[PDB]
Curated annotation (Swiss-Prot):
The gene is Dffb. It comes from the Eukaryota. This is DNA fragmentation factor subunit beta. Nuclease that induces DNA fragmentation and chromatin condensation during apoptosis. Degrades naked DNA and induces apoptotic morphology. Heterodimer of DFFA and DFFB. Interacts with H1-1. It is found in: Cytoplasm; Nucleus. Disulfide bonds: none annotated. Transmembrane segments: none annotated.
Length: 87
């Protein structure tokens, strides 16, 4: 029973509308997301996020258990991210 977290999760919050990212770490991955949409300010409407792993697309509310150092990028209808592949 129970479920203590013996390992904080980290996520790189990069932003295409900026010049860098924000490697934020936190035990409850839910904390990294919220604080993520905050320092980056990403509203659900007229906005959108995407995984920088290979150009995937996701939102700050659709991130269940992101992987370690989850790569997230800020984006919006006025922005877009191709992907991190070689094709």
């Amino acid at each position: 029973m129970c479920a203590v977290l013996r390992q904080p999760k980290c996520v790189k919050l990069r932003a295409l509308h900026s010049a860098c990212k924000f490697g934020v770490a936190a035990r409850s991955c839910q904390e990294l997301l919220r604080k993520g949409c905050v320092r980056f300010q990403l509203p659900m409407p007229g906005s959108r996020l995407c995984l920088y792993e290979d150009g995937t697309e996701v939102t700050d509310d659709c991130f269940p258990g992101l992987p370690n150092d989850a790569e997230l990028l800020l984006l919006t209808a006025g922005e877009t991210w191709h992907g991190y592949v070689s094709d």
